[PDB]
Amino acid sequence: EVIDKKAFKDMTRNLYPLNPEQVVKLKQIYETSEYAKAATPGTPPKPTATSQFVNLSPGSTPPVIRLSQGFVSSLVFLDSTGAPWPIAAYDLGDPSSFNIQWDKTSNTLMIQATKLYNYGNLAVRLRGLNTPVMLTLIPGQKAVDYRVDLRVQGYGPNA
């Protein structure tokens, strides 16, 4: 009847071949595996919500927005008195690297970098401005602009 005993020890080996020590071994191995896969190269961008004054006179450099691959950056458009400026429309350069969403009435442009460091620019004409607003969008910086309170030079339909 030890025939039976050796059969059974043998296949407590075979059917379930990882003694439960080995199964938590593999669980932890995979844990570290895709924790390493989850690791970011270097320090990630600092999440900052900034505010900038937009200067539209000739000779001024355009506002520059820090982005990051796969992160939302929201641009809100504000007049000199701090009231919202609804957007007329926008035209983004190279949207194969950037993805922009906007509900068609509001004044919030939410942009993600679909590529790591490929930068571009974006024009946005507003309700009250004949001249639109330029912004150069650079991803992969040491900071990520979660939101930019850009302060347009003019006075909008809200005063």
């Binding site: 003694n19 439960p20 020590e21 938590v24 071994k25």
Partner: peptide
């Protein structure tokens, strides 16, 4: 840190 179900007496 201990996973005692990998237990050996």
């Amino acid at each position: 840190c201990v996973s005692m179900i990998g237990g050996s007496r």
